[PDB]
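Repro case for the chain-ordering regression, as requested:
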Amino acid sequence: LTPNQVNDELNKMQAFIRKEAEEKAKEIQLKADQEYEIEKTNIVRNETNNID
Amino acid sequence: DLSVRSLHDIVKPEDFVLNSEHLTTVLVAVPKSLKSDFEKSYETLSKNVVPASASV
Amino acid sequence: SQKNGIATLLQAEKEAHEIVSKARKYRQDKLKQAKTDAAKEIDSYKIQKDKE
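-- result from build under test --
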């Protein structure tokens, strides 16, 4: 109702967007690590067959 | 009369701010009677309604 | 105004872009690390059994 309210909204929404971006980045990094591990395990446990 | 023409030579481009890729600026028009009357109920909008810079 | 709602924005989205660029570079080097680790693991697996 006053420029104080909108000044609060500015920072509020900017904080929401940046924190969502950080959380999404962390989640995708975790999924990247999961892909790392799973692909490594699949490669090793498939190659061991021909090695044997 | 106005509102029947197009906009190709009566306005200039360098007013719509594209500095930010979040704000969107619409160059809407109003009658004379209430030209400044939209200078009161105009700030409930979202983040960064760049103030003290809108005019005709 | 002409500076409060202009420069802070561009700086914030530059920060977001650099964050996601760091993420992408991490993805590239982590995929390199994943494939290299898998290959070295399978080679270490094969060499000892070759000794056997």
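Ordering looks correct now. Chain B touches chain C at residues 17, 19-23, 48, 50-53 (CB under 8 Å).
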